[PDB]
């Protein structure tokens, strides 16, 4: 059961999520249309490549955490 999709503007940036050198991928997140690698842990929490050691409950929470971490910076693919 993948999480639902989402789409919102968070701190001025568009964050989107959708079910789908890095792992497989059951879910995709984008920050301003650049893909954010995210990964699900066994307990259902999520991390991302810009907050890898810090589980959060949902892919939207990981997208928001990434926007927080980036401080306006473009993501690199």
Partner 1 sequence: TVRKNQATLTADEKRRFVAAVLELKRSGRYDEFVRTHNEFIMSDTDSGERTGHRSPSFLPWHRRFLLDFEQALQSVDSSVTLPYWDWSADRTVRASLWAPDFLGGTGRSTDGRVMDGPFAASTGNWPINVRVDSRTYLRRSLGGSVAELPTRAEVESVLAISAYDLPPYNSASEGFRNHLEGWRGVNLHNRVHVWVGGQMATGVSPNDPVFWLHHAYVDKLWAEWQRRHPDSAYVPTGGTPDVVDLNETMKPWNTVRPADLLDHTAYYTFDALEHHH
| Binding positions for partner 1, rule: CB under 8 A | 21-24, 37, 39-43, 49-55, 69-71, 73-76
Measured from the CB of residue 48, what is the shortest distance to Cu ion in angstroms?
A: 11
Give the strand order in the sheet containing 51-56: 38-40, 46-48, 51-56
Q: Find the part of the chain contacting Cu ion (CB under 5 A) among 10-18, 24-32, 57-65, 66-74.
A: 24-32
Count of positions on this chain that bind Cu ion (CB under 5 A) = 3
Q: Under DSSP, is residue 47 helix (H, G, I), strand (E, B) or coil?
A: strand
Using CB distances below 5 to 8 A depending on partner kind, what does residue 33 bind out of partner 1, Cu ion, none?
A: none
Closest CA to 66 of 21, 24, 23, 14: 14
55 within 8 A of 46, measured Cβ to Cβ: yes
Q: How far is the CB of 56 from partner 1 (least distance, A)?
A: 12
């Amino acid at each position: 059961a993948a999480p639902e999709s989402f789409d919102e503007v968070y701190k001025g940036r568009r964050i989107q999520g959708r079910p789908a050198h890095e792992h497989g991928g059951g879910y995709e997140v984008f920050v301003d249309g650049v893909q954010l690698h995210v990964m699900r842990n066994a307990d259902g929490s999520w991390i991302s490549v810009v907050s890898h050691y810090d589980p959060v409950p949902t892919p939207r929470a990981a997208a928001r955490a990434a926007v927080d971490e980036l401080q306006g910076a473009p993501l690199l693919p």
